[PDB]
Enzyme design. Structure first.
Site, short mmCIF file in Angstrom:
data_model
loop_
_atom_site.label_atom_id
_atom_site.label_comp_id
_atom_site.label_asym_id
_atom_site.label_seq_id
_atom_site.Cartn_x
_atom_site.Cartn_y
_atom_site.Cartn_z
N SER A 6 -3.92 -11.61 8.88
CA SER A 6 -4.18 -11.85 7.46
C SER A 6 -5.46 -11.16 7.00
CB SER A 6 -4.21 -13.35 7.16
OG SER A 6 -4.96 -13.68 6.00
N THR B 145 -5.59 1.63 -6.02
CA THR B 145 -6.32 2.83 -6.43
C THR B 145 -5.54 3.72 -7.37
OG1 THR B 145 -7.42 2.70 -4.28
CG2 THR B 145 -7.80 4.75 -5.51
N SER C 161 0.81 -1.23 0.00
CA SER C 161 0.00 0.00 0.00
C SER C 161 0.85 1.29 0.00
CB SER C 161 -1.02 -0.02 1.13
OG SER C 161 -1.79 -1.20 1.09
N1 LIG Z 1 0.42 10.87 -1.79
C1 LIG Z 1 -0.72 10.42 -1.26
N2 LIG Z 1 -1.29 11.14 -0.27
C2 LIG Z 1 -2.50 10.77 0.18
N3 LIG Z 1 -3.26 9.74 -0.20
C3 LIG Z 1 -2.66 9.03 -1.17
C4 LIG Z 1 -1.42 9.29 -1.75
N4 LIG Z 1 -1.11 8.33 -2.69
C5 LIG Z 1 -2.14 7.52 -2.67
N5 LIG Z 1 -3.11 7.87 -1.76
C6 LIG Z 1 -4.32 7.12 -1.41
O1 LIG Z 1 -4.05 6.39 -0.23
C7 LIG Z 1 -4.33 5.00 -0.43
C8 LIG Z 1 -3.05 4.19 -0.46
O2 LIG Z 1 -3.17 3.05 -1.35
P1 LIG Z 1 -3.39 1.44 -1.00
O3 LIG Z 1 -3.93 0.35 -1.93
O4 LIG Z 1 -4.77 1.90 -0.68
O5 LIG Z 1 -2.58 2.05 -2.23
P2 LIG Z 1 -2.99 2.27 -3.75
O6 LIG Z 1 -2.46 3.60 -4.36
O7 LIG Z 1 -4.46 2.16 -3.78
O8 LIG Z 1 -2.24 1.03 -4.42
P3 LIG Z 1 -1.16 0.07 -3.78
O9 LIG Z 1 -1.82 -0.81 -2.76
O10 LIG Z 1 -0.65 -0.67 -4.84
O11 LIG Z 1 -0.10 0.87 -3.13
C9 LIG Z 1 -5.26 4.95 -1.64
O12 LIG Z 1 -6.62 5.06 -1.21
C10 LIG Z 1 -4.78 6.13 -2.48
O13 LIG Z 1 -5.79 6.69 -3.32
O1 LIG Z 2 -1.84 -5.60 -0.07
C1 LIG Z 2 -1.52 -5.80 1.10
N1 LIG Z 2 -1.16 -4.74 1.92
C2 LIG Z 2 -0.74 -4.87 3.21
N2 LIG Z 2 -0.61 -6.01 3.87
C3 LIG Z 2 -0.94 -7.10 3.12
C4 LIG Z 2 -1.39 -7.10 1.79
N3 LIG Z 2 -1.56 -8.40 1.34
C5 LIG Z 2 -1.19 -9.15 2.36
N4 LIG Z 2 -0.79 -8.43 3.47
C6 LIG Z 2 -0.12 -8.96 4.69
O2 LIG Z 2 0.22 -10.32 4.47
C7 LIG Z 2 -0.05 -11.10 5.66
C8 LIG Z 2 -1.15 -12.10 5.41
O3 LIG Z 2 -2.18 -11.57 4.54
P1 LIG Z 2 -2.70 -12.57 3.43
O4 LIG Z 2 -1.59 -12.73 2.42
O5 LIG Z 2 -3.88 -11.90 2.75
O6 LIG Z 2 -3.00 -13.83 4.14
C9 LIG Z 2 -0.33 -10.09 6.77
O7 LIG Z 2 0.86 -9.79 7.51
C10 LIG Z 2 -0.92 -8.90 6.00
O8 LIG Z 2 -0.76 -7.70 6.73
MG LIG Z 3 -3.41 -2.08 -1.44
#
Ligand SMILES: Nc1ncnc2c1ncn2[C@@H]1O[C@H](COP(=O)(O)OP(=O)(O)OP(=O)(O)O)[C@@H](O)[C@H]1O
Ligand SMILES: O=c1[nH]cnc2c1ncn2[C@@H]1O[C@H](COP(=O)(O)O)[C@@H](O)[C@H]1O
Ligand SMILES: [Mg+2]
Ligand SMILES: Nc1ncnc2c1ncn2[C@@H]1O[C@H](COP(=O)(O)OP(=O)(O)OP(=O)(O)O)[C@@H](O)[C@H]1O
Ligand SMILES: Nc1ncnc2c1ncn2[C@@H]1O[C@H](COP(=O)(O)OP(=O)(O)OP(=O)(O)O)[C@@H](O)[C@H]1O
Ligand SMILES: Nc1ncnc2c1ncn2[C@@H]1O[C@H](COP(=O)(O)OP(=O)(O)OP(=O)(O)O)[C@@H](O)[C@H]1O
Ligand SMILES: O=c1[nH]cnc2c1ncn2[C@@H]1O[C@H](COP(=O)(O)O)[C@@H](O)[C@H]1O
Ligand SMILES: O=c1[nH]cnc2c1ncn2[C@@H]1O[C@H](COP(=O)(O)O)[C@@H](O)[C@H]1O
Ligand SMILES: O=c1[nH]cnc2c1ncn2[C@@H]1O[C@H](COP(=O)(O)O)[C@@H](O)[C@H]1O
Ligand SMILES: [Mg+2]
Ligand SMILES: [Mg+2]
Ligand SMILES: [Mg+2]
EC number: 6.3.4.25
Lengths: 343, 343, 343, 343
Positions: free
Chosen positions: C127, C44, C14
């Site tokens: 998880s 996202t 994330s």
């Molecule tokens: N620079 C930023 N400042 C604030 N919010 C952000 C920023 N970059 C991304 N976000 C938001 O914060 C969240 C972080 O992403 P998490 O999945 O949610 O990441 P993602 O951008 O959606 O993709 P990924 O999981 O691959 O990193 C998302 O809801 C995204 O829209």
């Molecule tokens: O996209 C992701 N973002 C953050 N943690 C994740 C994500 N996918 C899996 N995890 C981590 O992986 C472990 C098990 O998640 P699972 O792979 O979905 O079983 C935990 O420690 C979770 O926090």
């Molecule tokens: Mg994510």
């Protein structure tokens, strides 16, 4: 593209702008001469043979041996009667291969109405009362029902100016076609509406930026600025306004000269000592490349030579590399000397 | 000495001068921000975090991370009440180490009287009717008995502006002390008093030469001119004036956009097609070094890319080497793109 | 043959993989977009106009102006219902000249059974409990009698995916035909099954080698690896696992931010300080060519500028010549900046 | 940094990976030998003097005259009893200045439980039934209460492996310290979990990307890929799976050879004609730089020379510049010939 030589006054006006404009026109042979005068005052030029020009409308540079264009800017305020008299007076110079162009937005002076509106300020601020500001105000009012103030509208009923009144595009094209241009400023730096003596000042800024704007000249076109000064700055008579802290009011008697008077109003000119504060201020804003120091004939060699050094040090102090190149010892072409030759 | 970056509008105003000024202020971190606005214009800037500034008096460049000076030129016409509200809203930015300097000759607007005097032109020429010209006329009158129009005189009885009102020498010294300056123009090239649409125009020229003159900036200080334009130029609502021969009036419907409203009057804006004639004319006089093409979000990539090429060819045709450096796709900082990065 | 740009997460997931994928897709216009996501992750992307995509199945790069192919690798675990909703929401983008290819060996998630089998690890190891590993285990069992786990067998009775399910040769041919490919990784480096936090990790390695293997991409096809990171790394809520010795757990309060919620579970995210140990480790294995440093909006300029230098030195220390090329200041396209333009 | 030579099989396994690994180890003198084997099958090497090594755990490259490190990757599934027997068998080679490193996340085979769980697939898909997948599944379950599956946890109660079990950082550092590395793959390309014969395949992908991932080798470290093949590909006996459309099942009788059997299970090997489809597929994904063509002893010179040309044309057809550099005419070091010497 840098082909405009601009003539401006560094004090309170009446320094010899007409004398250096005629001199430079004869020496450099500009094909285009441009101005934006208001009826405030007339500029004089006297050539080597003794022929004299006193202009309130036409530039003094019409004496150029290569004259092709005479242009009167959007900032001009002029009497049609005066312009007719001035053209007729120089008909030999303004021949069939010379084009006179009046900007469509130049202001036509209604001498009856505009002089009457300036009667109060003629006494109170020692104004010329020529109608310049009253005409300028009428232009600014932008009443679509008024077809009697700008040249473009007056030309529809006054055929005397009709041939000369051009379009905005014709104006831009004439500047573009020009090889070398002589631009003439009016009044003087310290008379500016936005300098410290307000309300004892004129109705516009008397700076290079305002003159180029009033003549519709693009800034990359500017080549050189020639600033003009007197050894003893003058101011035009009555309750005309104050002076700088480092200067004092003198008398024509102290100088051993016949009292100087305005051409038509016959108002005695007030004369002051040279002000270094005035020069620093004028050098900062006007930034001239060359300086014409006039009325050196009222001083002794050490006196006018000392003022030359003051001016150059004033320039340097305000990031200006101004060189006093010309020295004026009389009202004629023959009285303009090259500095390097006399000192 | 060349440290002034000047922002100017190449069309009929409201093209995004506010936006590029804020953008450049954040990127280049100017220590001095200067303007000469009249109440007939309002400018908007929205930063990366969503904070919005809509200024009629203060420059938009006050968002500069190195702000030291905020200067309001001699050509300014302002409502004291408005200036107080604009200062209060950016009090965090305008802290104890930020000096606000109002030129002594800047005009104080008399809301009641000045607005009453523009009723009529507000309908007849589609004027904003904000009192800008009426205040400007009162200044020009130069009545020594009138101590209620210029800032220097108003400061004697109105202590709200007293600390800010400086002298002419303080003004010159502040420019001289400045490291890097952002100068902001107002209205637009085609609204100039001396362009072809007169009397359907504003009360001054909207050109680089007039802006520098109204801000009291020496010409050797100019570094760069950034011209601003829209893919579809706009005018204010009503009988505001004509257009160029190669352009046509459109509707917000034809463009598929929500109708735009003017900054000061809550009136609908008139929209036109891009004019190449207007560009050639603006490029000739204004000679910009860099161009900001805004509202590219109203066209498809081929449409706005084609306008970029038109602008550069219009520039080259008028001896101007203008580069379209910035492209606008929205009202905020994040929507300003480098042309080099998108095409 | 080197035409694959691979997006990977350098920390605990994330960090903004979704955002840079959409950004790169719009800038570089890839004809093929490929991934191998499991239901435990959501990504996202928000474009310049404000349109938002939150994908658990489809790549984020479907926003590419030259999209021709959308490919879901053999390593994918997906809900058919979710894929149908994700396709429907981007039906304008996924038009008749866009081919969607699901690898025959991609795993079809049994929502009820697979989620029920992850109850327990969802609490014990924090998880997501989305069924990802349970589905993966069923595939591995290789029961010839089971025709309900791989896409190729499910397509025989579920016509919703039938058109998309291709052969192994069709898969190889599509990669071979591709001009430029955007490959998107999931989860993050430190979540790898074979990194130090086991069993507090995911069911596969989150490294470039594993992603290429899961997408069936030959190694000579790899062109560039773009690694993504946050100034303050995050973990999911609960007993999700430990951290590195040089980092500490923080609170959203300490950072002055609104508490962040996880993409799939509406749970609060755990936040930590930047870890240089994590970077060295990630740089060693993942060896990125370019880095996207996101969430710089949570720090001051000196803070995020310092992290840029830490990342580059961490890279050089592990024989990696990674350049921090992109900087994130918000969740949309307009908030992605070039590092070269801001510092 | 490119110092890893990777050995992989281009058909269905049992081609001579052990023979070329021993041969290359003796010729190139690698200081590090690395693998990630599962208990599926044992690889054989016989040197010039007749000494024989049959390994299920240890790499075959331990015969390297400059051996310094023996590393067993995170993807390994091994019997501790087998590893003890194998080390003791080569104690002269695995001396005091040789370090054996078992990745902390390598899987320890519970021979009682894991073989019992594979009893069904041993008949149904013709699986080896060695427990490889059952052990792999237990690892994936990530039960924090289970301390009996990964090497790091087993080392806490089984001191036989304790000295060898390293940390993740020790693993990364050993690769970084290495001068030249021999990486050994297992099974074969067509046996991949994601190739067309599923479920008649193994529990992972048998491709260069998966092997590097399972050994924790960064991609920039890869120098060369050496692919292995037989003139008549074999498959391991029973209901083992199908073949390619351009190949046919043969008999050991047709070839005039003694029937080949698996080492422990004594399962007769199924033998097929050479498949050009198989080569194109294997060349596309595996992209080898060099090829070892083994069991040329089962054909006449024209027969094995023709297969050499087929392989090189198959490579070129899939953008691969593979050179058949080695030819195998028996099970011993002395039977490996340089292609350029025999044809
Ligand atoms: N620079 C930023 N400042 C604030 N919010 C952000 C920023 N970059 C991304 N976000 C938001 O914060 C969240 C972080 O992403 P998490 O999945 O949610 O990441 P993602 O951008 O959606 O993709 P990924 O999981 O691959 O990193 C998302 O809801 C995204 O829209
Ligand atoms: O996209 C992701 N973002 C953050 N943690 C994740 C994500 N996918 C899996 N995890 C981590 O992986 C472990 C098990 O998640 P699972 O792979 O979905 O079983 C935990 O420690 C979770 O926090
Ligand atoms: Mg994510
Ligand atoms: N050095 C000089 N000595 C004596 N008289 C001079 C000299 N130079 C100029 N004059 C006269 O000074 C008078 C005052 O200037 P006037 O405004 O009438 O015209 P000008 O000399 O061209 O000045 P300007 O154009 O600056 O207004 C003129 O009548 C002119 O002939
Ligand atoms: N690219 C754009 N697309 C849409 N709206 C925009 C864009 N650029 C600016 N805007 C908004 O449209 C209006 C146009 O400005 P008008 O004054 O209102 O211009 P400005 O940016 O405020 O400044 P200026 O008058 O100097 O051009 C403002 O309200 C501004 O926030
Ligand atoms: N060209 C050859 N002729 C005859 N026997 C050979 C030849 N090359 C290898 N062998 C034998 O083939 C058998 C089958 O291979 P096995 O899996 O047991 O080990 P390997 O040869 O190293 O194969 P791999 O490592 O590919 O699995 C071995 O017992 C080996 O000694
Ligand atoms: O050309 C000029 N020469 C000298 N004084 C001038 C000139 N133009 C204006 N002035 C002075 O400027 C002031 C205002 O002039 P007005 O513009 O005519 O009202 C008065 O003090 C005038 O004497
Ligand atoms: O900022 C501006 N944007 C657009 N039109 C303006 C602006 N300022 C003045 N105008 C135009 O200038 C003319 C008169 O407006 P005024 O200058 O406010 O009297 C009209 O044609 C207006 O449309
Ligand atoms: O090393 C190997 N050599 C030959 N066949 C193998 C090897 N590993 C797995 N197989 C085959 O792969 C299939 C599945 O094997 P499993 O991974 O042991 O279940 C069976 O058909 C095995 O015969
Ligand atoms: Mg005079
Ligand atoms: Mg506006
Ligand atoms: Mg074997």
């Amino acid at each position: 593209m840098e082909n405009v030589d601009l003539v401006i006054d560094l004090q309170f006006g009446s320094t010899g702008k007409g004398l250096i404009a005629g001199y430079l026109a004869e020496k450099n042979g500009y094909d285009t001469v441009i101005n934006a005068n208001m009826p405030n005052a007339g500029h004089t030029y006297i050539n080597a043979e003794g022929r004299k020009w006193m202009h309130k409308v036409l530039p003094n540079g019409i004496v150029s041996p290569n004259l092709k264009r005479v242009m009167l800017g959007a900032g001009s305020v002029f009497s049609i009667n005066r312009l007719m008299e001035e053209i007729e007076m120089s008909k030999d110079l303004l021949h069939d291969k010379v084009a006179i162009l009046i900007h469509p937005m130049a202001t036509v002076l209604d001498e009856e109405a505009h002089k009457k509106a300036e009667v109060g300020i003629a006494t109170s601020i020692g104004s010329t009362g020529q109608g310049s500001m009253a005409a300028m105000v009428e232009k600014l009012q932008r009443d679509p029902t008024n077809n009697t103030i700008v040249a473009r509208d007056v030309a529809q009923y006054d055929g005397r100016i009709a041939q000369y009144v051009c379009t905005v595009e014709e104006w831009d094209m004439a500047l573009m076609a020009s090889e070398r241009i002589l631009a003439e400023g009016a009044q003087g730096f310290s008379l500016s509406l936005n300098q410290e003596f307000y309300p004892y000042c004129t109705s516009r800024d008397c700076t290079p930026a305002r003159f180029l704007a009033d003549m519709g000249i693009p800034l990359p076109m500017l080549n050189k600025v020639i600033g003009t000064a007197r050894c003893h700055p003058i101011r035009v008579g009555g309750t005309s306004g104050g002076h700088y802290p480092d200067q004092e009011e003198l008398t024509w008697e102290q100088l051993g000269q016949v009292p100087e008077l305005t051409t038509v109003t016959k108002k005695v000119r007030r004369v002051f000592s040279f002000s270094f504060i005035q020069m620093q201020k004028a050098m900062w804003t006007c930034q001239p490349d060359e300086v014409f120091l006039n009325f050196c004939n009222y001083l002794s060699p050490m006196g006018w030579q000392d003022i030359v050094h003051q001016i150059e040090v004033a320039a340097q102090s305000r990031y200006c590399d101004a060189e006093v190149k010309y020295l004026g010892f009389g009202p004629t072409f023959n009285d303009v000397e090259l500095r390097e030759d006399v000192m």
